[PDB]
PDB file of C-alpha atoms and ligand atoms in Angstrom:
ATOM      1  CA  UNK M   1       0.000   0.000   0.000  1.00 42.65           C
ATOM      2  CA  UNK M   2       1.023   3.778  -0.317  1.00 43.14           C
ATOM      3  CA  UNK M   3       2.456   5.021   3.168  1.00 40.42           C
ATOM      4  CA  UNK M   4       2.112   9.279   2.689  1.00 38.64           C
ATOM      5  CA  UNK M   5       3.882  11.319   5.104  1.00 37.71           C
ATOM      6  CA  UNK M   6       3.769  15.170   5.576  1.00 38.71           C
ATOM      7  CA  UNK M   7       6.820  17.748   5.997  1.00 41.48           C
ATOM      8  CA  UNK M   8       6.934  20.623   9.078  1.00 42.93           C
ATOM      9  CA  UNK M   9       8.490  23.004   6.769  1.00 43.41           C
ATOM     10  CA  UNK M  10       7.208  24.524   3.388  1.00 41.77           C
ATOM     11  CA  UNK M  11       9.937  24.966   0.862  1.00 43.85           C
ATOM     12  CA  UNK M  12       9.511  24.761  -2.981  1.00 44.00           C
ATOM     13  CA  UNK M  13       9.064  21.920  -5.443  1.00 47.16           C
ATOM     14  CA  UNK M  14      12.721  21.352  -6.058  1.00 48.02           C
ATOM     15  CA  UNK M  15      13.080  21.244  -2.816  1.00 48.01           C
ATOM     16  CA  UNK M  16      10.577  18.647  -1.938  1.00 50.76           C
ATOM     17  CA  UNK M  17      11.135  16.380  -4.843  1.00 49.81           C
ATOM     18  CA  UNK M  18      14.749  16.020  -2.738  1.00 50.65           C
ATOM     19  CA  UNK M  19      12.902  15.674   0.438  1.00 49.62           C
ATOM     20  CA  UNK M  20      10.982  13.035  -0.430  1.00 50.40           C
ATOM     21  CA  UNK M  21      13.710  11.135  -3.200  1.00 50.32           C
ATOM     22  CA  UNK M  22      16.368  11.332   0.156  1.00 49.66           C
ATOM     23  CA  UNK M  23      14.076   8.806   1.692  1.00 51.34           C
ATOM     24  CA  UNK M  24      13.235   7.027  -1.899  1.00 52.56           C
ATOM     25  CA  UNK M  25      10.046   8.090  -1.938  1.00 52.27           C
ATOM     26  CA  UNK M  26       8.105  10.616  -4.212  1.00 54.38           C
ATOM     27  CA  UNK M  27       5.948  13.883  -3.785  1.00 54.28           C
ATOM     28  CA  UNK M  28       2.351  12.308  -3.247  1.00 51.58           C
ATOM     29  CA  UNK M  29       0.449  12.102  -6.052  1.00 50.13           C
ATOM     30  CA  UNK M  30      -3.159  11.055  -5.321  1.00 49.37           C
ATOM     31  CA  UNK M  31      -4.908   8.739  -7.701  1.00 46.20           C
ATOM     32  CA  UNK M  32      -8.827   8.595  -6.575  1.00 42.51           C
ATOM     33  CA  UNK M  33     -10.316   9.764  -3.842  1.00 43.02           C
ATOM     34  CA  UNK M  34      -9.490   7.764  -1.199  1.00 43.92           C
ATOM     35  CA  UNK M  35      -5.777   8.596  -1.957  1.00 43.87           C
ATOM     36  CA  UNK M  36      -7.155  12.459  -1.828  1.00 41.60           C
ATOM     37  CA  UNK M  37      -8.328  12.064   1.734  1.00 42.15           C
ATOM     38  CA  UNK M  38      -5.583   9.369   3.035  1.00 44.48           C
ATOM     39  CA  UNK M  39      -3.128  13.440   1.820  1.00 45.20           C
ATOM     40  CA  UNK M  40      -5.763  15.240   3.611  1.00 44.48           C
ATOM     41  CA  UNK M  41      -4.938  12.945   7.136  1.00 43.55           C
ATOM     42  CA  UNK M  42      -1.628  13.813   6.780  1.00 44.88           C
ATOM     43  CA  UNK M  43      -1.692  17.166   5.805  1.00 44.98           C
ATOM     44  CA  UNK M  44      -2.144  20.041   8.391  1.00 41.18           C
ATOM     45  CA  UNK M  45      -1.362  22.858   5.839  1.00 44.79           C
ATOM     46  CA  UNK M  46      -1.303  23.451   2.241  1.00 43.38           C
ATOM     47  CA  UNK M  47       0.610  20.793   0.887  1.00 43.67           C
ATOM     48  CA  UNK M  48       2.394  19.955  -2.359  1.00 47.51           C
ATOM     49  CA  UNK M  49       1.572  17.067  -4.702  1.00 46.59           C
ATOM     50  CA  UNK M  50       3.646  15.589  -6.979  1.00 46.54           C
ATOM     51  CA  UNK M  51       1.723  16.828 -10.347  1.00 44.42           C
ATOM     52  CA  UNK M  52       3.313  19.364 -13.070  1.00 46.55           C
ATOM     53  CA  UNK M  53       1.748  21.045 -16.489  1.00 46.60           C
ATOM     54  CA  UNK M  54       5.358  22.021 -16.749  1.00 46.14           C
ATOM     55  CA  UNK M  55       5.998  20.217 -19.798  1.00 45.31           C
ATOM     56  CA  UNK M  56       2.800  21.675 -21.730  1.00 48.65           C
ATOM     57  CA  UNK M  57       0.665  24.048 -20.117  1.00 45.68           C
ATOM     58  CA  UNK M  58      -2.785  22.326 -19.295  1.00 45.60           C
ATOM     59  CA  UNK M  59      -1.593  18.969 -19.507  1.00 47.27           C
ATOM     60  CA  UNK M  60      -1.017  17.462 -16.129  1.00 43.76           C
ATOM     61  CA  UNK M  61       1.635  14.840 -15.511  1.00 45.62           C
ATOM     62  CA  UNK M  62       2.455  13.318 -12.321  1.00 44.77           C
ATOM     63  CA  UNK M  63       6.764  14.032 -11.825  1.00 43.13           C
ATOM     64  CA  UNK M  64       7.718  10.634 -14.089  1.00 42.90           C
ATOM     65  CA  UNK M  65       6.203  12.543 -16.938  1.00 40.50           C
ATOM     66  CA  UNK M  66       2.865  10.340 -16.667  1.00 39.88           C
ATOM     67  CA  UNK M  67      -0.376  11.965 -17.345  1.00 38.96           C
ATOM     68  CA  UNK M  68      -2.587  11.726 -14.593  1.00 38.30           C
ATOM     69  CA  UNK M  69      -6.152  11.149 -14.672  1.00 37.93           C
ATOM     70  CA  UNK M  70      -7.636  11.828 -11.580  1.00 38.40           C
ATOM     71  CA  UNK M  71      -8.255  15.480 -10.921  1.00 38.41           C
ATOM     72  CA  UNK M  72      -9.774  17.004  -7.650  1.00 38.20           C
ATOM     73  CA  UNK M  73      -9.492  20.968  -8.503  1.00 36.63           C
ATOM     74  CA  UNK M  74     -11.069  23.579  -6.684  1.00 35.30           C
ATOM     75  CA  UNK M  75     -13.716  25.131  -7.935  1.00 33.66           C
ATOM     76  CA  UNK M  76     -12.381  27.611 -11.058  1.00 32.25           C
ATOM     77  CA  UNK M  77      -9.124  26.177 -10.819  1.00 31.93           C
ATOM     78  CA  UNK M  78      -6.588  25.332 -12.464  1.00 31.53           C
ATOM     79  CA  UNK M  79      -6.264  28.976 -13.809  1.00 30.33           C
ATOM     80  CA  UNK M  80      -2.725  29.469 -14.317  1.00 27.86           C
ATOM     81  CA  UNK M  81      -2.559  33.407 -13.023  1.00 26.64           C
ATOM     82  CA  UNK M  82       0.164  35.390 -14.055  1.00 23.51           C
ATOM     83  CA  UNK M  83       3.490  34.410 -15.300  1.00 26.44           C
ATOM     84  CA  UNK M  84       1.891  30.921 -14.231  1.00 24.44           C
ATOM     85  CA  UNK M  85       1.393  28.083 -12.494  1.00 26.55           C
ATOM     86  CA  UNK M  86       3.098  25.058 -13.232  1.00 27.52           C
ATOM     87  CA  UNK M  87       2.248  22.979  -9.583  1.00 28.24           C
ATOM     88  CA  UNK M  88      -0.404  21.665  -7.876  1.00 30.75           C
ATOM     89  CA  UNK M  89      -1.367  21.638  -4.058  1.00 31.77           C
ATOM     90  CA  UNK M  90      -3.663  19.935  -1.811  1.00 30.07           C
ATOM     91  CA  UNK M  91      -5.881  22.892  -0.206  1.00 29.78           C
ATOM     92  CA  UNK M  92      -7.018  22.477   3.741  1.00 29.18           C
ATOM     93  CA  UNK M  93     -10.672  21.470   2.164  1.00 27.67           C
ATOM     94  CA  UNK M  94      -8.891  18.591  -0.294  1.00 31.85           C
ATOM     95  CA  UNK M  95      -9.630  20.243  -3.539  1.00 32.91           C
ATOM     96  CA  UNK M  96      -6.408  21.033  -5.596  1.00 31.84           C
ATOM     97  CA  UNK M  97      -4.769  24.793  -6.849  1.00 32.01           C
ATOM     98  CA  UNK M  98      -2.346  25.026  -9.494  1.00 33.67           C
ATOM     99  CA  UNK M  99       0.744  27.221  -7.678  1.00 31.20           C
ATOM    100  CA  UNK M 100       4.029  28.951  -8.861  1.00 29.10           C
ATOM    101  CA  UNK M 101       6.369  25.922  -8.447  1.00 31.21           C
ATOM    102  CA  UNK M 102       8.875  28.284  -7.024  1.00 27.53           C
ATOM    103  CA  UNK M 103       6.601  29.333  -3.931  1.00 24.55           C
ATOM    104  CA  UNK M 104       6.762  27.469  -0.488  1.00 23.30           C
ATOM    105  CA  UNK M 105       4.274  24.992   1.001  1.00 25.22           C
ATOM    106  CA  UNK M 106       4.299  21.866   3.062  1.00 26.46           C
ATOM    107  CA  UNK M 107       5.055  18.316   1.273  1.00 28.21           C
ATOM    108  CA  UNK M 108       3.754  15.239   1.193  1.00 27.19           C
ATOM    109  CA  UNK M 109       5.723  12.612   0.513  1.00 26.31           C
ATOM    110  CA  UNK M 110       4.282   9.018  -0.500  1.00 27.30           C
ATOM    111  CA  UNK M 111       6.063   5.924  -0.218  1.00 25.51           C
ATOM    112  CA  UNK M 112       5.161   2.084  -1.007  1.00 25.01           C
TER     113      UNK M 112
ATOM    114  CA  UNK G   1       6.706   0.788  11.951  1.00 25.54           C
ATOM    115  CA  UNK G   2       7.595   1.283   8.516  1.00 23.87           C
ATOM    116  CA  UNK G   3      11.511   1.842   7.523  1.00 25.53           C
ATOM    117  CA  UNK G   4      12.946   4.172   4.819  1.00 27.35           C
ATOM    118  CA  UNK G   5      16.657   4.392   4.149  1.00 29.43           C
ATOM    119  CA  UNK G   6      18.599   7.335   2.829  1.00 28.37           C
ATOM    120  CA  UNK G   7      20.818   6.845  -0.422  1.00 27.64           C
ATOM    121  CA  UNK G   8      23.669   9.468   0.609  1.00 28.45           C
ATOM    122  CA  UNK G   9      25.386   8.943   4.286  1.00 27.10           C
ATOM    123  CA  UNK G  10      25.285  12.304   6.906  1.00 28.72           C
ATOM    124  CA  UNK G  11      26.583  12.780  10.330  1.00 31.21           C
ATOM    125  CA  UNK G  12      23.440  12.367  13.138  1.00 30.36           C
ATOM    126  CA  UNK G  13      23.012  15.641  13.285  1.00 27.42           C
ATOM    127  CA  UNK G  14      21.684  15.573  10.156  1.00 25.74           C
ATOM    128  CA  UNK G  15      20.072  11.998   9.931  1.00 30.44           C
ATOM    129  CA  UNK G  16      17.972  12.968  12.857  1.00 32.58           C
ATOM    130  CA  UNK G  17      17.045  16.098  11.044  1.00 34.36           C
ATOM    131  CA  UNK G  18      15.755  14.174   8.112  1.00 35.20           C
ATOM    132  CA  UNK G  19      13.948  11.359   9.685  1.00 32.84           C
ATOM    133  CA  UNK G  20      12.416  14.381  11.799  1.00 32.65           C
ATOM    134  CA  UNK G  21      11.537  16.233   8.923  1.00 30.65           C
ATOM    135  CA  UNK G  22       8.653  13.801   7.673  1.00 28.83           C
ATOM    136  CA  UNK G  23       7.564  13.185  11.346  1.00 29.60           C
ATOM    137  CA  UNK G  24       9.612  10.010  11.586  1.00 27.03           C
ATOM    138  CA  UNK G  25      12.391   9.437  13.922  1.00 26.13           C
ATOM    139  CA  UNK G  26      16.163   7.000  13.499  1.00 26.41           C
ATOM    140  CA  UNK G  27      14.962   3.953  13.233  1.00 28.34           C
ATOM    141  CA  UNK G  28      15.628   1.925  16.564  1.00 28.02           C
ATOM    142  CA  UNK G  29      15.385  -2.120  16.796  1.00 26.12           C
ATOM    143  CA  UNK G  30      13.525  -3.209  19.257  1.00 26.32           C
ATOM    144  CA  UNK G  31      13.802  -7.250  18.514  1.00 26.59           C
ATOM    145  CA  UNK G  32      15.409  -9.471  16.135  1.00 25.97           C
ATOM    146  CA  UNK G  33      12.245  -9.091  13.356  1.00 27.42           C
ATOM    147  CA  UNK G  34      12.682  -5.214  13.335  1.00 24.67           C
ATOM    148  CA  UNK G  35      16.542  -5.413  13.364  1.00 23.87           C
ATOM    149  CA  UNK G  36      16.523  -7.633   9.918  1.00 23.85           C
ATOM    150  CA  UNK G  37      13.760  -5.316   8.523  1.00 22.15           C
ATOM    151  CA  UNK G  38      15.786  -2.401   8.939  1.00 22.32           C
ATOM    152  CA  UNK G  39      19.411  -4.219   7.868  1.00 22.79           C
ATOM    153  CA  UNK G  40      17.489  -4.997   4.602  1.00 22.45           C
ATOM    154  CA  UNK G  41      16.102  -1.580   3.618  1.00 20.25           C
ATOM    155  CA  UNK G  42      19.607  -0.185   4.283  1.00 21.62           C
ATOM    156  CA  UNK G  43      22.060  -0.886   1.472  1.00 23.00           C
ATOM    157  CA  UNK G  44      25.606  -0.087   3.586  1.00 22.41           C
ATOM    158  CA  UNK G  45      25.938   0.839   7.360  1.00 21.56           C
ATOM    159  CA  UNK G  46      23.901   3.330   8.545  1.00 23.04           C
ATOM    160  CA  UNK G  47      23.110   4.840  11.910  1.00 21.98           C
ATOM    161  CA  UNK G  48      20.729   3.998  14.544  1.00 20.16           C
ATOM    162  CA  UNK G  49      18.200   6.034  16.876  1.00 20.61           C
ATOM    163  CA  UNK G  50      20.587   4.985  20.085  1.00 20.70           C
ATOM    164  CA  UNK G  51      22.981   6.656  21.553  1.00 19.15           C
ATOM    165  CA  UNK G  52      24.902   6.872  25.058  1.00 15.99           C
ATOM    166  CA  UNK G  53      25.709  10.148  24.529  1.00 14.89           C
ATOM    167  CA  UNK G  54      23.965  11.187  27.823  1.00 15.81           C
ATOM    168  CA  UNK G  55      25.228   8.943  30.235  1.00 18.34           C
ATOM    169  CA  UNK G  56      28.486   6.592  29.279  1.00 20.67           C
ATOM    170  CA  UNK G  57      27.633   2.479  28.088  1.00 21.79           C
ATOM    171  CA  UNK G  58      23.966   3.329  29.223  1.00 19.59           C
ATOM    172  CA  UNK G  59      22.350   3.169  26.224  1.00 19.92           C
ATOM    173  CA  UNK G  60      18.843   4.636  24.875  1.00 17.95           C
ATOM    174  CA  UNK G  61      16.708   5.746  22.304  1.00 17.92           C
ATOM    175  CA  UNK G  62      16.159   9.056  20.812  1.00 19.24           C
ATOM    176  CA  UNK G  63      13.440  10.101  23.440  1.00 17.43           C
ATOM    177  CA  UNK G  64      15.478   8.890  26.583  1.00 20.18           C
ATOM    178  CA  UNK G  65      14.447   5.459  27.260  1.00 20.97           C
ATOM    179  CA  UNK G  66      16.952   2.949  27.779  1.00 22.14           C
ATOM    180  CA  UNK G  67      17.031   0.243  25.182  1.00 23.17           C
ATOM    181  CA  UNK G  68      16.424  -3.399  25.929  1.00 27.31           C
ATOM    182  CA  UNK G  69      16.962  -5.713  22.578  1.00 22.91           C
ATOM    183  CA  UNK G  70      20.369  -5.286  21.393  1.00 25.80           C
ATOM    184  CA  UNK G  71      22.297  -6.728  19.220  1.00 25.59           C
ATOM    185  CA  UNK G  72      26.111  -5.696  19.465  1.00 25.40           C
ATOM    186  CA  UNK G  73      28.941  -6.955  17.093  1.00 27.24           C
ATOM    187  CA  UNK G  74      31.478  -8.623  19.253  1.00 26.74           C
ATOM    188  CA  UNK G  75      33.513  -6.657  20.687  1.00 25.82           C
ATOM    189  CA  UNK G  76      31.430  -3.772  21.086  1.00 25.78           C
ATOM    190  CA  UNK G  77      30.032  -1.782  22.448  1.00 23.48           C
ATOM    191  CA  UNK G  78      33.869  -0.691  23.001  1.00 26.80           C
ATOM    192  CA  UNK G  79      33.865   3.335  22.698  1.00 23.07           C
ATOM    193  CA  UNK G  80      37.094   3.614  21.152  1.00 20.92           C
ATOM    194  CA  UNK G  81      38.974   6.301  19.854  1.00 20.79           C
ATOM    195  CA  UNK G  82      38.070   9.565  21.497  1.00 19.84           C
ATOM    196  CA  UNK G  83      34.810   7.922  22.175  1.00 21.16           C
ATOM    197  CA  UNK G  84      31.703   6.754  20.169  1.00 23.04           C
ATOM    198  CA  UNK G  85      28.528   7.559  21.328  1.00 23.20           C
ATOM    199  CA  UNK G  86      26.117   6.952  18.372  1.00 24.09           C
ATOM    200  CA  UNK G  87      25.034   2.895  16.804  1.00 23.66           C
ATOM    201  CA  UNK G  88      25.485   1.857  13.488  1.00 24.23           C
ATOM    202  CA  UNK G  89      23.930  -1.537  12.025  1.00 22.76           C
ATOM    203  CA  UNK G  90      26.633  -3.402  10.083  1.00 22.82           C
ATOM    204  CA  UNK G  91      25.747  -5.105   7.063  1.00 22.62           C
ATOM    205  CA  UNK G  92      25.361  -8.459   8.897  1.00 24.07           C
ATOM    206  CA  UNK G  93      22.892  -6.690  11.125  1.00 25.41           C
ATOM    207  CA  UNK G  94      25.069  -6.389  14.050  1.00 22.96           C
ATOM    208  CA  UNK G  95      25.445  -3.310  15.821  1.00 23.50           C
ATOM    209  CA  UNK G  96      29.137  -0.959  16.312  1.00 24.43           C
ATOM    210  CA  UNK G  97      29.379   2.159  18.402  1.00 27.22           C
ATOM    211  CA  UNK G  98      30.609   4.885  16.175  1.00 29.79           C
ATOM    212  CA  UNK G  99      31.689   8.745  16.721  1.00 29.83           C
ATOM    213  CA  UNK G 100      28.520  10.760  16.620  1.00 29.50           C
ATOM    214  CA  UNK G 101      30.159  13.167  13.968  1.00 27.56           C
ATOM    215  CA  UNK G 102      30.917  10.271  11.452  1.00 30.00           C
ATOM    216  CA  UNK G 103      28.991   9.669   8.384  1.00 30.45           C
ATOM    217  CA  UNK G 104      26.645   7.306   7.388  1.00 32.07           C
ATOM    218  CA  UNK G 105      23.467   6.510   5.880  1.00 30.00           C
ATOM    219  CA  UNK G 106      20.268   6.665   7.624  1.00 27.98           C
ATOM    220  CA  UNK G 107      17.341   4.531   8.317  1.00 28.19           C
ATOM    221  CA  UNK G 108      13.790   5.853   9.600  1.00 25.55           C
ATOM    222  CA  UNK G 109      11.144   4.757  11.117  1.00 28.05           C
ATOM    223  CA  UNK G 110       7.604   5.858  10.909  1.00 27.59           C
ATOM    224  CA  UNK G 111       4.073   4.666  12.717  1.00 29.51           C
TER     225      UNK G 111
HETATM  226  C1  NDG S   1      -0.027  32.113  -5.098  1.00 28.82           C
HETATM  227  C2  NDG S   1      -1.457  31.619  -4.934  1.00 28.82           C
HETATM  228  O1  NDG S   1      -1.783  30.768  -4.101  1.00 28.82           O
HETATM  229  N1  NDG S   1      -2.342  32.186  -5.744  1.00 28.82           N
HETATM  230  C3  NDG S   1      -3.747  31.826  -5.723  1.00 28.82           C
HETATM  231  C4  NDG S   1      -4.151  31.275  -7.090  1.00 28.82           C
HETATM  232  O2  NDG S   1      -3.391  30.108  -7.386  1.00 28.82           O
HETATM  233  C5  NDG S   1      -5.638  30.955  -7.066  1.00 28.82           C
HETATM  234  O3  NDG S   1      -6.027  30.445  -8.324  1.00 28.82           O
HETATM  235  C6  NDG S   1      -6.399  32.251  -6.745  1.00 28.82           C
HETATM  236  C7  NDG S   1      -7.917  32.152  -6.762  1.00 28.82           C
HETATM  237  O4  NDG S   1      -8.412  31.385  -5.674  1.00 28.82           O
HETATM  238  O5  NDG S   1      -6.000  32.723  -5.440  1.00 28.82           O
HETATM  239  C8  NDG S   1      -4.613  33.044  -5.347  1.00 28.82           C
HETATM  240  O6  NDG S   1      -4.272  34.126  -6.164  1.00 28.82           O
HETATM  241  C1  NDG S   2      35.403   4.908  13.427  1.00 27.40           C
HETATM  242  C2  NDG S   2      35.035   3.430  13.435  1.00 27.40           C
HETATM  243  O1  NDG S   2      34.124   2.964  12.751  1.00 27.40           O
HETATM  244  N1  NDG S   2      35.795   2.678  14.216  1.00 27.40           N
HETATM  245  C3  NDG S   2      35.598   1.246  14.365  1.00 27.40           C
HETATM  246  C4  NDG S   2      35.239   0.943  15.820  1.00 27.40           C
HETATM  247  O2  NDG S   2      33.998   1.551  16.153  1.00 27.40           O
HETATM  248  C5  NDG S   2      35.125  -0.550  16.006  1.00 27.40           C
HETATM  249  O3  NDG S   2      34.856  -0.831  17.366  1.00 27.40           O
HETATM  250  C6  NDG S   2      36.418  -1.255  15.568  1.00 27.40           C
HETATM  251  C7  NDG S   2      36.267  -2.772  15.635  1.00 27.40           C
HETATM  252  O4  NDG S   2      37.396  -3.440  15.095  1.00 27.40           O
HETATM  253  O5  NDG S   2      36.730  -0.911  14.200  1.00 27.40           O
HETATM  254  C8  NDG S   2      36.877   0.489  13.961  1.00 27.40           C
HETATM  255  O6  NDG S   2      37.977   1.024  14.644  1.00 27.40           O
HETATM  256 CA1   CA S   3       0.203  25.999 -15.726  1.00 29.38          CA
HETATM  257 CA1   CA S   4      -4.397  28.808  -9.343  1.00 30.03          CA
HETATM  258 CA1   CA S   5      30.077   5.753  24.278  1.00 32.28          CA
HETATM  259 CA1   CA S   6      33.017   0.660  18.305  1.00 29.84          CA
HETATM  260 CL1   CL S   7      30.508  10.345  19.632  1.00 29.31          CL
END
């Protein structure tokens, strides 16, 4: 099964793909709902998930280049505002943003 | 429990920093089953959530309580050197006391 575990500090995407790869595990990347929730348990804050449209904007991939096909946005997301948003986090209410990879949040890391 | 090993080797400082980041702590044996569990997810030596760092051959876990399994390589515990107050598990699961500011890799432990 998929163990997920949360950081204490928020740092960017970079940051927590080497977080989580230290430990041989990946940035969580939920793939149905109970997955969503299982992040939500875990996650006390705003957390990062392991999902990118960094390759070609709209197209989500999960950080082996996979497109993923399970989506949870929020409501009028994902909008990509200003010079964009390339990442994806888990909000407090389970529903997903697309975020600035370079901005900080909490990570969740899953492992198997 | 479930056990996670680093790939690159750190003092532990640093190990306990990781394994602290993701909520976990340095993974610490507490029989036979969970000794070969962690030997097996670690590829090379790595360090141990037991220390006698406190008090001198008394030696417990990260959060003060004094270990009872153990599973020491002969010869040791044997605080050589200028002392070694920090555990390593060999790679035939036994255990060596090692300087504190040496490196190697890391194994954690989560509930
Ligand atoms: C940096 C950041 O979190 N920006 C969010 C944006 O992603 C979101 O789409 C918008 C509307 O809810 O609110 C904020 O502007
Ligand atoms: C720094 C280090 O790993 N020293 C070890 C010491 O801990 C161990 O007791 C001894 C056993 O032969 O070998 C080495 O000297
Ligand atoms: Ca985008
Ligand atoms: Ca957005
Ligand atoms: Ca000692
Ligand atoms: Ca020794
Ligand atoms: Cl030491």
């Amino acid at each position: 099964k998929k163990y997920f575990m949360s950081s204490v500090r928020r740092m960017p995407l970079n940051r927590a793909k080497a977080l989580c790869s230290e430990l041989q595990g990946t940035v969580a990347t939920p793939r149905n709902a109970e997955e969503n929730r299982a992040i939500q348990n875990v996650a006390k804050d705003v957390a990062f998930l392991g999902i990118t449209d960094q390759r070609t904007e709209n197209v989500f991939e999960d950080l082996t280049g996979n497109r993923v096909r399970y989506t949870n946005w929020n409501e009028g997301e994902p909008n990509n505002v200003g010079s964009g948003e390339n990442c994806v986090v888990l909000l407090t209410n389970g529903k997903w943003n697309d975020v600035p990879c370079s901005d900080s949040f909490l990570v969740v890391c899953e492992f198997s």
